[PDB]
Design an enzyme around this catalytic site. Structure first.
Site, PDB file in Angstrom:
ATOM      1  N   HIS A  77       0.847  -1.194   0.000  1.00 57.79           N
ATOM      2  CA  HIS A  77       0.000   0.000   0.000  1.00 57.79           C
ATOM      3  C   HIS A  77       0.885   1.248   0.000  1.00 57.79           C
ATOM      4  CE1 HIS A  77      -3.259  -2.785   1.560  1.00 57.79           C
ATOM      5  NE2 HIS A  77      -3.862  -2.157   0.566  1.00 57.79           N
ATOM      6  N   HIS A  81       1.483   1.410  -5.802  1.00 53.16           N
ATOM      7  CA  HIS A  81       0.126   0.876  -5.892  1.00 53.16           C
ATOM      8  C   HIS A  81      -0.850   1.940  -6.372  1.00 53.16           C
ATOM      9  CE1 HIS A  81      -3.831  -0.554  -4.980  1.00 53.16           C
ATOM     10  NE2 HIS A  81      -3.971   0.306  -3.989  1.00 53.16           N
ATOM     11  N   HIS A 117      -6.016   7.594  -3.361  1.00 50.92           N
ATOM     12  CA  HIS A 117      -6.962   6.807  -2.574  1.00 50.92           C
ATOM     13  C   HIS A 117      -6.336   6.076  -1.391  1.00 50.92           C
ATOM     14  CE1 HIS A 117      -5.407   3.245  -4.706  1.00 50.92           C
ATOM     15  NE2 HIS A 117      -5.965   2.557  -3.727  1.00 50.92           N
ATOM     16  N   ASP A 118      -5.007   5.982  -1.310  1.00 50.03           N
ATOM     17  CA  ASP A 118      -4.357   5.279  -0.208  1.00 50.03           C
ATOM     18  C   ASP A 118      -3.328   6.146   0.506  1.00 50.03           C
ATOM     19  OD1 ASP A 118      -5.554   2.853   0.254  1.00 50.03           O
ATOM     20  OD2 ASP A 118      -4.323   1.753  -1.195  1.00 50.03           O
ATOM     21  N   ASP A 226      -8.296  -0.429  -8.345  1.00 46.29           N
ATOM     22  CA  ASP A 226      -7.649  -0.706  -7.065  1.00 46.29           C
ATOM     23  C   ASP A 226      -7.082  -2.123  -7.027  1.00 46.29           C
ATOM     24  OD1 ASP A 226      -6.761  -0.108  -4.537  1.00 46.29           O
ATOM     25  OD2 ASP A 226      -8.696  -0.259  -3.538  1.00 46.29           O
ATOM     26  N   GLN A 259      -4.942 -16.637  -2.982  1.00 49.39           N
ATOM     27  CA  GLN A 259      -5.182 -15.858  -4.192  1.00 49.39           C
ATOM     28  C   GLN A 259      -6.415 -16.357  -4.933  1.00 49.39           C
ATOM     29  OE1 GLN A 259      -3.441 -13.344  -3.172  1.00 49.39           O
ATOM     30  NE2 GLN A 259      -2.731 -12.866  -5.246  1.00 49.39           N
TER      31      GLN A 259
HETATM   32  O1  LIG Z   1      -6.630  -2.088  -0.677  1.00 46.18           O
HETATM   33  C1  LIG Z   1      -5.935  -2.200  -1.774  1.00 46.18           C
HETATM   34  O2  LIG Z   1      -5.277  -1.276  -2.234  1.00 46.18           O
HETATM   35  C2  LIG Z   1      -5.974  -3.518  -2.449  1.00 46.18           C
HETATM   36  C3  LIG Z   1      -6.057  -4.662  -1.779  1.00 46.18           C
HETATM   37  C4  LIG Z   1      -5.540  -5.969  -2.195  1.00 46.18           C
HETATM   38  C5  LIG Z   1      -4.723  -6.095  -3.319  1.00 46.18           C
HETATM   39  C6  LIG Z   1      -4.249  -7.330  -3.723  1.00 46.18           C
HETATM   40  C7  LIG Z   1      -4.585  -8.473  -3.001  1.00 46.18           C
HETATM   41  C8  LIG Z   1      -4.094  -9.799  -3.408  1.00 46.18           C
HETATM   42  O3  LIG Z   1      -3.378  -9.998  -4.387  1.00 46.18           O
HETATM   43  N1  LIG Z   1      -4.495 -10.834  -2.601  1.00 46.18           N
HETATM   44  C9  LIG Z   1      -5.286 -10.660  -1.498  1.00 46.18           C
HETATM   45  C10 LIG Z   1      -5.618 -11.856  -0.679  1.00 46.18           C
HETATM   46  C11 LIG Z   1      -4.520 -11.995   0.351  1.00 46.18           C
HETATM   47  C12 LIG Z   1      -4.705 -11.551   1.653  1.00 46.18           C
HETATM   48  C13 LIG Z   1      -3.689 -11.664   2.588  1.00 46.18           C
HETATM   49  C14 LIG Z   1      -2.472 -12.221   2.237  1.00 46.18           C
HETATM   50  C15 LIG Z   1      -2.296 -12.659   0.943  1.00 46.18           C
HETATM   51 CL1  LIG Z   1      -0.766 -13.351   0.478  1.00 46.18          CL
HETATM   52  C16 LIG Z   1      -3.298 -12.556  -0.001  1.00 46.18           C
HETATM   53  N2  LIG Z   1      -5.752  -9.480  -1.104  1.00 46.18           N
HETATM   54  C17 LIG Z   1      -5.399  -8.371  -1.864  1.00 46.18           C
HETATM   55  C18 LIG Z   1      -5.871  -7.118  -1.470  1.00 46.18           C
HETATM   56 MG   LIG Z   2      -7.381   1.713   0.477  1.00 43.63          MG
HETATM   57 ZN   LIG Z   3      -5.749   0.691  -2.721  1.00 40.41          ZN
END
Ligand SMILES: O=C(O)/C=C/c1ccc2c(=O)[nH]c(Cc3cccc(Cl)c3)nc2c1
Ligand SMILES: [Mg+2]
Ligand SMILES: [Zn+2]
Length: 301
Positions: A77, A81, A117-118, A226, A259
Site C-alpha cells: 500500500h 500501488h 486513494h491510499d 484498485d 489468491q
Molecule cells: O486495498 C488495496 O489497495 C488492495 C487490496 C488488495 C490487493 C491485492 C490483493 C491480493 O493480491 N491478494 C489478497 C488476498 C490476500 C490476503 C492476505 C495475504 C495474501 Cl498473500 C493474499 N488481497 C489483496 C488485497
Molecule cells: Mg485503500
Molecule cells: Zn488501494
C-alpha cells in the site's frame, strides 16, 4: 526541490512510448521520476491539463507531494500501488473507451482519486495509529476518510492547487466525486453495493443516465482498478502477491489458495460485470482468469 527541478524540465514522452495504455502495464523498471512523467501524460492525454488550465509547475509539485505522502516502508500500500491504480483508470478510459460515457469533471476526479486513494497508508498491520486517533470511532471507512483528508490537504497546499482553474461549482462537484471515489475503495462498501450493480447488469437495466447508477458505476470502477494487480500477466502478478504477503505476514505455502479465494470471492464477478458494461475491458477479466488458473495449479501442489 531538486526532484521538482528535474521533473518540470523533462519532456514528457507519449502515452504509447510509456505503455500506459496497456492493461498489462507494469512499473518495476521505472524510476520514481519516470512514474511522475507517466502521471503527467495521464493528465495530458485525458485533456485535463487543457480543459482545466493546469499550470505545469503546479501539476508537477502536486504529483510529487502525492508521491511523498505514501510510505515506502509499506510493502504494497504505497505510491506504486496508487500509480498503478491510476494507470489502470487511464487504460480503462482509453483502451476500454469508457471515457466517452463520463464528463470531464468525473474523469478529473477519478484520476485524482485513483492517485490519492491510499495516501499515508501505514500497512494492514499498523492500524493501531488510526486507533490512537479516533479512539471512539473504532467500532466507518476510518482509513478511506483519512485518505481523502490527506488528498484534500495536498490539493490545498500552496503551489499544489491543480483545481484552481475550476469554478467554485466545478470544484465542489469534483471534490464530491473524489470523496465518493476514495470512499468506494473500502472493500466493505464494495461488497455492500456490488449486488445492486450485478442485478442491474443481469436484468439489462444498467442506465448510465441515472444519477444513482452513474455513481454506482464510478464506485465499481474504482474497485476494479484498485484491485487490478490481480489481472496482470503471470510474472507481474507473482511479484505483487509477494508484496501483498510481505505487508500482511512480515509487517513490511498458503499464498496460492489465498489468491484463488480472493479471485473467486472479490474479483471475478466484478471484472465480469465490467465487461458487460464495455467489452473493451475484457483484458482485465481475461488476465484475472489466467491468474486464477496459475494460482490454482500451484495450490494443488
Ligand atoms: O486495498 C488495496 O489497495 C488492495 C487490496 C488488495 C490487493 C491485492 C490483493 C491480493 O493480491 N491478494 C489478497 C488476498 C490476500 C490476503 C492476505 C495475504 C495474501 Cl498473500 C493474499 N488481497 C489483496 C488485497
Ligand atoms: Mg485503500
Ligand atoms: Zn488501494
Amino acid at each position: 526541490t531538486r526532484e521538482l527541478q528535474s521533473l518540470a524540465a523533462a519532456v514528457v514522452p507519449s502515452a504509447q512510448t510509456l505503455k500506459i495504455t496497456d492493461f498489462s502495464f507494469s512499473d518495476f523498471e521505472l524510476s520514481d521520476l519516470e512514474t511522475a512523467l507517466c502521471t503527467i501524460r495521464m493528465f495530458t492525454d485525458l485533456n485535463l491539463v487543457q480543459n482545466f488550465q493546469m499550470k505545469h509547475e503546479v501539476l508537477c509539485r502536486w504529483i510529487l507531494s502525492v508521491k511523498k505522502n505514501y510510505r515506502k516502508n509499506v510493502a504494497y500500500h504505497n505510491w506504486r500501488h496508487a500509480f498503478n491504480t491510476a494507470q489502470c483508470m487511464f487504460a480503462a478510459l482509453k483502451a476500454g473507451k469508457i471515457q466517452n460515457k463520463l464528463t470531464d469533471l468525473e474523469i478529473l476526479a477519478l484520476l485524482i482519486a485513483a492517485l490519492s486513494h491510499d495516501l499515508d497508508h501505514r500497512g494492514v498491520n499498523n492500524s493501531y495509529i488510526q486507533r490512537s486517533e479516533h479512539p471512539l470511532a473504532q467500532l466507518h471507512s476510518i482509513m478511506e476518510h483519512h485518505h481523502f483528508d490527506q488528498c484534500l490537504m495536498i490539493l490545498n497546499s500552496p503551489g499544489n492547487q491543480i483545481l484552481s482553474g475550476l469554478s467554485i461549482e466545478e470544484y465542489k462537484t469534483t471534490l464530491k466525486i473524489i470523496k465518493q471515489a476514495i470512499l468506494a475503495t473500502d472493500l466493505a462498501l464494495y461488497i455492500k453495493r456490488r449486488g445492486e450493480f450485478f442485478e442491474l447488469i443481469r436484468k439489462n437495466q444498467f442506465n448510465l443516465e441515472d444519477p444513482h447508477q452513474k455513481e454506482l458505476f464510478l464506485a465499481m470502477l474504482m474497485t476494479a482498478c484498485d484491485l487490478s494487480a490481480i489481472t496482470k500477466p503471470w510474472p507481474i502478478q507473482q511479484r505483487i502477491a509477494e508484496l501483498v504477503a510481505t505487508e500482511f505476514f512480515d509487517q513490511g505455502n498458503k499464498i496460492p489458495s489465498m489468491q484463488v479465494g480472493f479471485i473467486d470471492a472479490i474479483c471475478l464477478q466484478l471484472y465480469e460485470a465490467l465487461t458487460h458494461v464495455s467489452e473493451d475491458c475484457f483484458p482485465l477479466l481475461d488476465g484475472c482468469r489466467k491468474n486464477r488458473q496459475k494460482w490454482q495449479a500451484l495450490a494443488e501442489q
